[PDB]
Design an enzyme around this catalytic site. Sequence first.
Site, PDB file in Angstrom:
ATOM      1  N   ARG A 173       0.815  -1.226   0.000  1.00 12.20           N
ATOM      2  CA  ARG A 173       0.000   0.000   0.000  1.00 12.20           C
ATOM      3  C   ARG A 173       0.846   1.273   0.000  1.00 12.20           C
ATOM      4  NH1 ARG A 173      -4.980  -2.497   1.693  1.00 12.20           N
ATOM      5  NH2 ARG A 173      -5.952  -1.130   3.252  1.00 12.20           N
ATOM      6  N   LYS A 202     -20.883 -14.588   3.872  1.00 11.79           N
ATOM      7  CA  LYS A 202     -22.320 -14.327   3.907  1.00 11.79           C
ATOM      8  C   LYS A 202     -22.855 -13.741   2.612  1.00 11.79           C
ATOM      9  CE  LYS A 202     -19.424 -11.452   5.865  1.00 11.79           C
ATOM     10  NZ  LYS A 202     -18.700 -12.496   6.640  1.00 11.79           N
ATOM     11  N   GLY A 240      -9.297  -8.630  -0.359  1.00 11.33           N
ATOM     12  CA  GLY A 240      -8.080  -9.133   0.270  1.00 11.33           C
ATOM     13  C   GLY A 240      -7.528 -10.528  -0.021  1.00 11.33           C
ATOM     14  N   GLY A 267     -14.288  -3.673  -0.706  1.00 12.07           N
ATOM     15  CA  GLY A 267     -15.721  -3.424  -0.626  1.00 12.07           C
ATOM     16  C   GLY A 267     -16.122  -2.116  -1.286  1.00 12.07           C
TER      17      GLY A 267
END
Length: 390
Positions: A34, A194, A348, A371
Amino acid sequence: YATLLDLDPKGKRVLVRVDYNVPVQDGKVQDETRILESLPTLRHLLAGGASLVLLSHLGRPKGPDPRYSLAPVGEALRAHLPEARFAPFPPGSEEARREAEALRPGEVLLLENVRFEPGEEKNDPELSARYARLGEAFVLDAFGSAHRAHASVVGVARLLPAYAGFLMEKEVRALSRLLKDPERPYAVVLGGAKVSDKIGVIESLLPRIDRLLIGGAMAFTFLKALGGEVGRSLVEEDRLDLAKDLLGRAEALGVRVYLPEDVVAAERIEAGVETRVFPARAIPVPYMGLDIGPKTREAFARALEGARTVFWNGPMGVFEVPPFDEGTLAVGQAIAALEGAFTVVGGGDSVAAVNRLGLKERFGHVSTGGGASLEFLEKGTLPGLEVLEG
């Protein structure tokens, strides 16, 4: 949507929101990726004659927490930019304002974890005004944080001329291709624990795609919805209804959906645990499906043959747990092997799989939004992008 080419940094103090949420252990960054990804933006500004104040988040600290200090990131950044320093002062503090006001052109100042500030996640106006005192212009280059209207992402953006950094610009253009008549066949590979967290984006993508491959724990809600027996596999009873409706509309929209047909299972999630392979719709009670099986890896790769556009986000199984990372690694090589296609990988564990396989260069775009990326594809924008104008 203003970019860095619209900003003249000469003699200015530029506040930049970067994404430095890197893994740390024993006061040391474990992965500098990063930090490296932000240098193009930082060096361009420095080259133009600016001084810089950097803001970033790190972990999910509960208020001040030494465990999540950015000091280790400061040392890592210093190896790359000789004039970069870290100051243990919270972003909206008086000490921090004074540290930034003392900055000389060419210097780079990294302040403490923004999550240490109680008004950060609430977009507190006072806190935002405080950040505005840190510089004369604002640059948002943390796409992974643009989906939330936080003080250092949206708030301060409204009080200073705000622009998008190179990383932000690149992420936006790669994702835009996916919403602007990309080459068919267009396949999407989604994974995760989920289903409830992927419904929005699934609905948004259905009318634009030709193929949907679903892996990870979320797939068992779908299997169960088709009347399968998934044993102790993770399922959201609260979503069985919508999952079945989604498969229906898919078919009606002419989208081919692929689900696991076999799985690698165990009685407990543990590294090295003994496993057994079972049919995906016939997992004996005690066992839990924790990764896609060999037949499934095979069928998935076959389903991707010929695709000219591919978007992949999510693990095919419990990636961080040693045996159960094999399905994710197999899907990564399958997509990497494709020719003549625009491939995008995000999230990730999926990115991690690509890196371990030394396959980064083989992908059209390696997403840094996670996300955030899913929400952009879902809604067509993000609050952190709407404030990037004049």
